[PDB]
């Protein structure tokens, strides 16, 4: 029949195309409805705090607290040296260094070499 | 001008036509350029005849620094700290005099070519091989010294060059 | 959070967001105005096949076409004076090797 | 320069006799003078430095440096008077006194004429700027971070005091002219190499060179306001001055040497553009843009040519005034909500219009804006760059893409957007706060106006 | 665009001429006198007039003419006409001695193409 | 002036905006047919183009085969 | 910039729209009458006319808020009260 | 009125400044204001000498 | 926008958005009224021809088949209103939008610039705290021991109150502020 | 709701300024610009009037296209129609693609 669509992780699936969509289980209601109670708690407390007419200042987010707790200084303390993580560090922490100091020192002998042999278009350089 | 030299800074002679019309019509450069002489040329003249007026009253003259020349670092013995000091303090003061000097070449260069207009590449080869002469001697002198360069290391560079010469005319008599 | 419900009351309306919800570890670069994941109306692996088709063959074209070139059934276009030698910065000294042009 | 010196030594006395409500406006005013005073260092020669005594000289390196110092101490202290208002008033003294001791210290090192009292100064700058991180910092961390910036400037500097007694030892002196009129080529050995590195690490540790920069996310996040400008604005151009200094007896080892060090800046420049592109802390990212502008800076000091030197000294002195300028904002906006995360105070361009203006003019600075100083500096040490290889435009073309990227970014995020709704305590910017931000950004303008004034001596 | 391109290309290239090496015979083969040709305008008045490089070819007198009739009647930017006309003139006369070139080059390579078949015939036969 | 909105209506237009837009759109056909008029060999060209078939051996200098 | 929308505008081109409605009757049509339970029509038939009020005013219905919508008086309270009418 | 004193003001007073200072400051140093030099064609008169620039030789004419 | 949500969409939600989205994309590509209203029509015969279904199970997958169907036909480039959030007009007011907060921070020379504004906004101010007691017990009272189970809130029950979190709903911006 | 009014005059000044050039100005700048260019006197006919031709045979096939659509005709679309209008898919892929992996090596790597 159509073609079908085949989600990428940069073009991922939409919910009308989802097969999960239209396999509900009686614990999927039951599922949803305790992430609605959870988002409606949520909701209520922070829409207390909103609209409490003696609040002057900002409404601390725990969860955003958490997130930039998380992403900056719980980083360190849950680090294992592994095979996985070393092999990555050592590869993107070192060789762009040594790509780079073999492309430099590639170029810069060869513009050496010409200098010494006396071939190399160095009129007008003035500045340097 | 006597504000500037004309033979440190030559400009060929000016050749502009005479106006030739063909037509009735009227010039509305022509009319501009009365309009534009009327209204701002004229204020602008007295403007400036006042304020050279108020300038003779106060004629007051200011004057060119010479300095005498001192022995250099050829003739300084080693580490004899005075005659070190005077001498680079000379050859400071003749790179910025070179760099003054190769300026105004390029000065005469660019000028050239914008006067020449679309001849620049005939009309301007007189400049360009003064440029080129004046710009190998200063690379020669000036070229690889680094950020901290010195009297010694020009001498030394020189003294390289000096040998590179003398070997390479042993080489061709040989 | 493009992909987020844009109609729904979020506490947040511009990055999409309720407060106290657990915040994504790569929020920072999926707000509206960064990487976008919404799905579209073509496949991924087909719209990369025929975008680098397109500039594959233009650039084949290209090539093919600049080993093909298209001119006019005419000759070279002639210059009075030894093609122009000293107006192109000529040597006025060195004599020029003589360029001439004849009636036909 | 003891008509600098003295009248510093004399805000120390004033500052502790001045009455409990007249402290503030006496240091600025008197800071204020004296760096009006500083102005007149500007006049140098065109052949040799300023020699005032045996022990004190001005070149047209240290120049600007003394007065960007004298100029940021009464920016520092109007910052400072904002955050500190519920303190003692012998802590508000305290405060003020380690602020003038370290202007004090800063002023004879760029002045100092010997290669050892130099250390000693640059070394005397840590105890002051360790004293307020770890006494004013407003969070834990901060006793960390003063531990690291601690310890990494003296393991850096430890080498360069047994490098310099040593030179001493061999050659006679450490006086600045004496040993650029007496210096002799370094033959290519193993006691050389130790030698160049001995010194370079300490000025590398103290630039920040990238792999060796972790105290100063550390320090000038934890840091008061104060710190953070004085920390960012000067003290990271201790460094520099000593790499430029040092480096006429090094010669013509720095040609072998540099290698690493280029290549750890290049790199590292871009690995931090692109940290700062995924940065949920303003101080954090405003740290990281300093870590690649110093990047920068140190690649210009390695390939060491005299369009690289002026290059040097303009990146210098206009990372020290916009650093300066962006820490004060983020500081401002820190006392409206008291936090630190990007994202938690949004549409402050509909809620503090001026503030809005000073954050796009001070980001528009961070980015090389022609023809901003900063342009002027990025685009000399691209230029010798480019002379020294041609892979070198690779990397600074990417450096600048990323630079605009992350400075218009963190501008939109902060100010552009619809306001957070439940934060409801952004009083309207104070006259102190818009003139601080005045004070920063107009002298950057004057000095794009004047350039000279701040190119150095190879110019 | 033309059949040229198509001769050349789905065709036999070594008939049809090469634009970037012609000519490829001597200016005299086959003419017996041949007039060189006739430059008006000189060196220096071309430099005075600032020609562009490329206008100064053989036709660069009737172009000074126009700048001058140009320049003088400046108001009336209508009253050049005529010279505007021989420049053309002057021009396409150019152009068809251009494209007599190329012809010329053309039957003088299918010419020399029938001569060395013949003689490859006749020394096989 | 004021011009009321029309609700499933037809717009209020003025005599000004109309004469204006004819007059322009009249001066341009009466430009277009007066530049065509005048030269019209901008467009269908002006010098004819020559056959290369027509030219002689002759006048191309060629020599018969033979010879 | 366009005349502001007052009520009885809105609740007259609603009824406007209503009536050019076939399914409605015009003469019983009234700002109370239920789509459902005294107009009898079917979910196609009020999305229909949701949609219909939507090309009439220009802006979109969410469908969360436009399944509620079962009165000429709710479609009129909720247009106003979304373009910020008071008068 | 009002537009007679903008008129004053916004360009008569500008084009004044920039006058003098073209015309007494820029134009006081060497090459700081180059003007391309006029062109000359056959038959002119150079007015700075009074010179006489010879026309072209006779044309080949054509129709 | 003004409605709390569901915890998830009937079948008939669902199959009616499916229409409606299926209309909007068809009057994108039929841009003529005529040619719209007659494929309108027809694609109401579809879903009129499938109303009346007892099985559900084939219900949801006439339900799934179509939505792929759509997938496959729909406009790359579908029609949205200039104000929708898709559109061109989205969110440009945004920036033009000021809170009362921001607004009492005001100078009192520019609050005595306007005398008889503040007067009102001085009464509502006294209004709203006289109220938020009671609609916090309201709010208390009515909630179950686990939670709320939902995001809608109740009215006001008497005579002199409220209905609970009113504020902000009632003194949002306009939505043409300046 | 019909709005439509466009009698005012600033509009009408300013699009009547810029109607006027689009009519004459060229003419008036070809014809005083001086001649830094050779012309093209002789070409073919064909090649004389290439421009006006291609012009008009898109007037004509893009008009008889969209008389097409008035017919009661439905058919859904092409991969060259999707291909055209979603701006060649080059958006999509070079501004979800590079600036993802980009974004990712800053976190994750650096
Ligand atoms: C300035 C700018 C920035 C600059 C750059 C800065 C950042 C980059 C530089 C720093 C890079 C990281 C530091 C170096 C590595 C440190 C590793 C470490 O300390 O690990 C301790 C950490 C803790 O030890 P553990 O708790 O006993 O083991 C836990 C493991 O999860 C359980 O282990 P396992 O049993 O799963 O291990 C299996 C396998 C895991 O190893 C691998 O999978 C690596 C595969 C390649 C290994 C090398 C191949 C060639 C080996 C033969 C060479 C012969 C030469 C003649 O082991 C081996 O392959 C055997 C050992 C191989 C040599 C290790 C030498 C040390 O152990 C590991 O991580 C295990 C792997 C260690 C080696 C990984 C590869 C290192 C590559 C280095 C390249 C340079
Ligand atoms: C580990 C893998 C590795 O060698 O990475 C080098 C690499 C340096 O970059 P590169 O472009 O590969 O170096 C150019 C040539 O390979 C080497 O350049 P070259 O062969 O033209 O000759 C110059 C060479 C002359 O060779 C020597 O002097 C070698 C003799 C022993 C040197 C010991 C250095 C002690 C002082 C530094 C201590 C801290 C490190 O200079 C050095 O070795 C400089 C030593 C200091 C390097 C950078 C120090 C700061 C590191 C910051 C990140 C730390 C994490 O990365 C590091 O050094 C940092 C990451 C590893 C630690
Ligand atoms: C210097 C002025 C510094 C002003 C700082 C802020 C003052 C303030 O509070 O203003 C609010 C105050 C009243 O505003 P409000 O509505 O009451 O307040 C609410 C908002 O704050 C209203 O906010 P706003 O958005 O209306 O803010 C106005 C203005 C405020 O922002 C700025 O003024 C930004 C200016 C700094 C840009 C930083 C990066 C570039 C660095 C260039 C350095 C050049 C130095 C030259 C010498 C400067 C000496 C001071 O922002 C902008 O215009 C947006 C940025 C546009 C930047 C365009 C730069 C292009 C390159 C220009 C190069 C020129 C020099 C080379 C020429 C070579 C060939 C001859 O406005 C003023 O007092 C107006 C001041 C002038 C504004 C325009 C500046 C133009 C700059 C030159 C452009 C080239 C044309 C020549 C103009 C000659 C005059
Ligand atoms: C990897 C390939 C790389 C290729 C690189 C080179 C690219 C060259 C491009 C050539 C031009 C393509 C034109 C069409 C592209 C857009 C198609 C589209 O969706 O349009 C809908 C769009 C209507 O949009 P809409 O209102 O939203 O309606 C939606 C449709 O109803 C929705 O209905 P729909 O989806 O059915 O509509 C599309 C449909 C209907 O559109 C057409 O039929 C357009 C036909 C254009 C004219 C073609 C024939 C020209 C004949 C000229 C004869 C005289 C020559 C000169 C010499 C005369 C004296 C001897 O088109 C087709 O089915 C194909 C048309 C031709 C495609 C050419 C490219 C081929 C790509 C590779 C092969 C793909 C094959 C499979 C296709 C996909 C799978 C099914 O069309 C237009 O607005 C106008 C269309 C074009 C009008 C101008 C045509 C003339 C100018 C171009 C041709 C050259 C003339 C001569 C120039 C001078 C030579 C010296
Ligand atoms: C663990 C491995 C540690 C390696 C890093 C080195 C740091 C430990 C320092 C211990 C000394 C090791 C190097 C010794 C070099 C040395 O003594 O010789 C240098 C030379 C000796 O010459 P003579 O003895 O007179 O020989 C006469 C020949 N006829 O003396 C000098 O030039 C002065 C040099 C001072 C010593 C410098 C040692 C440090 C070198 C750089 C390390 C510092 C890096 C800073 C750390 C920051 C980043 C971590
Ligand atoms: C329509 C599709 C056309 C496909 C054409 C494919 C390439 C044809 C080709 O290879 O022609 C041979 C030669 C050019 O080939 P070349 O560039 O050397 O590369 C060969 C490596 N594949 O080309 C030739 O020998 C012909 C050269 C013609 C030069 C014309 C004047 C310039
Ligand atoms: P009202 O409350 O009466 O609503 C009646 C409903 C529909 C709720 C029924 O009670 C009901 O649920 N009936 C059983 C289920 C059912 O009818 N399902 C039908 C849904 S899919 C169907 O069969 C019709 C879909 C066909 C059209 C698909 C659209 C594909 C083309 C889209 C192209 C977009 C651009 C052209």
């Given at each position: 029949s159509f073609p079908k669509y085949k989600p990428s992780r940069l073009a991922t699936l939409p919910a009308t195309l989802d097969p999960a969509e239209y396999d509900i289980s009686p614990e999927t209601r039951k599922a949803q409805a305790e992430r609605l109670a959870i988002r409606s708690r949520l909701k209520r407390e922070y829409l207390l705090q909103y609209n409490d007419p003696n609040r002057l200042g900002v409404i601390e987010d725990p969860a955003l607290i958490r997130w930039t707790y998380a992403r900056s200084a719980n980083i360190y303390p849950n680090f294992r040296p592994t095979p996985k993580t070393s092999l990555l560090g050592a590869l993107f922490?070192?060789?762009?260094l040594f790509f780079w100091y073999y492309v430099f020192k590639t170029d810069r002998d060869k513009k050496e070499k010409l200098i010494q042999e006396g071939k190399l278009d160095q009129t007008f350089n003035i500045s340097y | 001008p006597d504000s500037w030299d004309k033979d440190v800074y030559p400009e060929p002679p000016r050749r502009t036509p005479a106006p030739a019309p063909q037509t009735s019509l009227p010039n509305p450069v022509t009319y501009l350029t009365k309009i534009f002489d009327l209204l701002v040329d004229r204020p602008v003249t007295l403007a400036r005849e006042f304020i050279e007026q108020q300038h003779a009253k106060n004629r007051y003259y200011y004057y060119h620094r010479e300095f005498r020349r001192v022995p250099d670092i050829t003739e300084c013995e080693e580490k004899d700290i005075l005659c070190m000091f005077e001498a680079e303090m000379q050859w400071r003061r003749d790179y910025k005099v070179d760099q003054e000097i190769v300026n105004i070449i390029q000065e005469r260069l660019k000028a050239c070519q914008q006067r020449e207009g679309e001849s620049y590449r005939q009309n301007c080869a007189k400049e360009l091989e003064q440029f080129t002469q004046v710009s190998k001697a200063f690379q020669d002198r000036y070229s690889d010294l680094g950020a901290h360069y010195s009297a010694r290391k020009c001498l030394a560079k020189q003294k390289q060059r000096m040998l590179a010469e003398r070997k390479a005319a042993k080489e061709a008599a040989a | 959070q493009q992909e987020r419900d844009p109609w729904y009351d979020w506490d947040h309306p511009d990055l999409r967001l309720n407060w106290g919800e657990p915040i994504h570890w790569d929020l920072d670069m999926?707000?509206?105005?960064?990487?976008?994941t919404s799905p579209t109306p073509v496949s991924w692996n087909t719209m990369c096949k025929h975008l680098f088709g397109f500039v594959a063959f233009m650039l084949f074209m290209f090539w093919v076409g600049e080993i093909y070139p298209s001119y006019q059934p005419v000759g070279p276009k002639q210059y009075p004076y030894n093609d122009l030698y000293l107006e192109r910065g000529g040597d006025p000294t060195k004599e020029p090797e003589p360029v001439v042009h004849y009636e036909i | 320069m003891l008509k600098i010196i003295i009248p510093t030594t004399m805000l120390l006395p004033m500052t502790w006799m001045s009455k409990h409500n007249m402290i503030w406006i006496n240091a600025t005013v008197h800071s204020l003078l004296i760096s009006l005073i500083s102005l007149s260092l500007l006049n140098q020669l065109g052949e040799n430095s300023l020699n005032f005594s045996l022990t004190f000289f001005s070149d047209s390196l240290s120049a600007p440096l003394l007065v960007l110092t004298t100029w940021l101490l009464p920016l520092m202290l109007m910052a400072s008077q904002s955050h500190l208002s519920k303190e003692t008033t012998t802590r508000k003294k305290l405060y003020i006194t380690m602020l003038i001791l370290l202007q004090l210290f800063l002023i004879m090192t760029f002045t100092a004429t010997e290669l050892i009292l130099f250390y000693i100064l640059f070394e005397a700058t840590l105890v002051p700027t360790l004293i307020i991180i770890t006494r004013w910092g407003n969070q834990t961390e901060?006793?960390?971070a003063g531990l690291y910036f601690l310890f990494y400037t003296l393991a850096g500097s430890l080498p360069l005091l047994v490098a310099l007694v040593y030179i001493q030892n061999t050659t006679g002196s450490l006086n600045f002219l004496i040993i650029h009129y007496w210096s002799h080529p370094l033959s290519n050995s193993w006691s050389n190499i130790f030698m160049w590195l001995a010194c370079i690490m300490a000025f590398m540790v103290k630039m920040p060179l990238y792999g060796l920069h972790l105290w100063l996310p550390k320090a000038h996040v934890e840091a008061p306001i104060a710190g953070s400008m004085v920390l960012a604005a000067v003290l990271l151009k201790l460094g520099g001055y000593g790499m430029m200094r040092i480096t006429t007896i090094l010669n013509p080892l720095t040609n072998y040497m540099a290698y690493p060090f280029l290549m750890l800046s290049m790199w590292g420049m871009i690995m931090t553009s692109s940290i700062c592109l995924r940065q949920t802390d303003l101080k954090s990212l405003i740290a990281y843009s300093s870590v690649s502008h110093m990047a920068l800076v140190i690649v210009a000091i390695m390939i060491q040519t005299p369009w690289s030197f002026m290059g040097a000294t303009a990146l210098m002195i206009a990372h020290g005034l916009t650093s300066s300028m962006l820490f004060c904002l983020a500081n401002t906006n820190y006392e409206r909500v008291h936090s630190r995360t990007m994202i938690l105070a949004r549409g402050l361009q509909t809620l503090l219009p001026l503030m809005a203006?000073?954050?796009?003019?001070?980001?528009?600075?961070?980015?090389?804006?022609?023809?901003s100083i900063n342009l002027i500096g990025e685009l000399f040490i691209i230029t010798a760059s480019f002379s020294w290889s041609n892979i070198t435009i690779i990397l600074m073309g990417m450096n600048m893409m990323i630079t605009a990227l992350y400075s218009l970014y963190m501008l939109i995020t902060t100010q552009r957007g619809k306001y957070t709704h439940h934060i409801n305590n952004i009083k309207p910017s104070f006259t102190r706060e818009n003139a601080l931000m005045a004070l920063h950004i107009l002298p950057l303008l004057l000095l794009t106006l004047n350039p000279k004034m701040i190119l150095g001596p190879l110019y | 665009?033309?059949?040229?391109?198509?001769?050349?290309?789905?065709?036999?290239?070594?008939?049809?001429?090469?634009?970037?090496?012609?000519?490829?015979?001597?200016?005299?083969?086959?003419?017996?006198?041949?007039?060189?040709?006739?430059?008006?305008?000189?060196?220096?008045?071309m430099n005075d007039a600032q020609l562009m490089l490329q206008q100064r070819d053989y036709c660069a007198h009737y172009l000074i003419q126009l700048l001058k009739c140009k320049r003088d009647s400046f108001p009336n930017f209508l009253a050049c006409k005529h010279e505007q006309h021989d420049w053309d003139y002057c021009e396409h006369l150019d152009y068809v001695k251009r494209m007599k070139e190329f012809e010329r080059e053309r039957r003088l390579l299918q010419r020399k193409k029938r001569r060395e078949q013949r003689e490859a015939e006749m020394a096989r036969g | 002036v004021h011009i009321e909105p029309r609700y499933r209506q037809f717009p209020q237009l003025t005599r000004s905006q109309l004469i204006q837009a004819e007059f322009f759109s009249a001066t341009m056909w009466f430009w277009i047919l007066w530049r065509f008029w005048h030269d019209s060999d901008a467009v269908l060209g002006h010098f004819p183009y020559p056959d290369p078939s027509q030219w002689t051996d002759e006048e191309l200098g060629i020599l018969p085969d033979d010879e | 910039d366009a005349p502001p929308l007052t009520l009885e505008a809105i609740k007259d081109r609603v009824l406007y729209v209503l009536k050019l409605y076939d399914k409605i009757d015009p003469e019983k049509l009234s700002v109370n009458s239920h789509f459902m339970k005294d107009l009898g029509l079917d979910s196609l038939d009020q999305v229909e006319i949701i949609m219909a009020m939507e090309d009439e005013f220009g802006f979109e219905i969410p469908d969360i808020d436009a399944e509620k919508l079962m009165c000429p008086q709710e479609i009129v309270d909720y247009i106003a009260d979304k373009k910020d009418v008071y008068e | 009125y009002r537009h007679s004193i903008f008129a004053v003001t916004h360009v008569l007073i500008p084009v004044w400044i920039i006058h003098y200072y073209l015309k007494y400051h820029v134009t006081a140093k060497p090459y700081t204001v180059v003007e391309r030099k006029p062109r000359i064609f056959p038959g002119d008169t150079i007015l700075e000498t009074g010179e006489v620039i010879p026309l072209m030789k006779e044309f080949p004419d054509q129709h | 926008a003004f409605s709390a949500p569901a915890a998830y969409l009937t079948h008939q939600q669902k199959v009616l958005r499916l229409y409606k989205r299926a209309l909007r994309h068809l009057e994108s590509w039929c841009v003529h009224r005529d040619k719209y209203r007659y494929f309108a029509c027809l694609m109401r015969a579809r879903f009129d021809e499938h109303k009346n279904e007892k099985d559900m199970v084939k219900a949801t997958q006439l339900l799934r088949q179509a939505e792929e169907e759509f997938w496959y036909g729909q406009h790359p480039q579908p029609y949205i209103f200039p104000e929708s959030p898709g559109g061109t007009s989205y969110e440009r007011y945004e920036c033009y939008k000021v809170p009362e907060w921001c607004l009492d921070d005001w100078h009192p020379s520019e609050k005595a610039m306007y005398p008889d504004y503040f007067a009102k906004r001085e009464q509502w101010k006294r209004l709203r705290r006289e109220s938020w007691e009671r609609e916090v017990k309201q709010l208390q009272e009515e909630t179950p021991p686990g939670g709320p189970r939902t995001e809608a809130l109740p009215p006001a029950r008497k005579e002199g109150d409220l209905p609970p979190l009113w504020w902000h709903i009632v003194t949002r911006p306009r939505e043409r502020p300046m | 709701l019909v709005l439509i009014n466009e009698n005012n005059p600033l509009l009408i000044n300013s699009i009547k300024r810029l109607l006027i050039g689009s009519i004459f100005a060229g003419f008036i700048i070809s014809n005083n610009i001086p001649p830094m260019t050779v012309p093209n006197t002789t070409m073919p006919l064909y090649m004389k009037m290439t421009a006006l031709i291609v012009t008009i045979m898109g007037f004509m096939l893009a008009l008889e296209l969209n008389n097409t659509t008035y017919y009661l005709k439905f058919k859904y679309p092409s991969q060259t129609y999707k291909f055209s209008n979603m701006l060649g898919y080059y958006p999509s892929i070079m501004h979800r693609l590079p600036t993802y992996h980009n974004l990712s090596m800053s976190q994750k790597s650096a």
């Open positions: 922490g070192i060789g762009p | - | 999926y707000i509206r105005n960064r990487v976008d | 901060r006793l960390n203006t000073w954050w796009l003019v001070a980001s528009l600075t961070n980015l090389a804006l022609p023809p | 665009m033309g059949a040229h391109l198509a001769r050349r290309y789905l065709g036999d290239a070594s008939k049809e001429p090469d634009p970037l090496r012609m000519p490829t015979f001597p200016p005299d083969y086959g003419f017996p006198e041949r007039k060189e040709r006739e430059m008006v305008a000189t060196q220096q008045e | - | - | - | - | -």
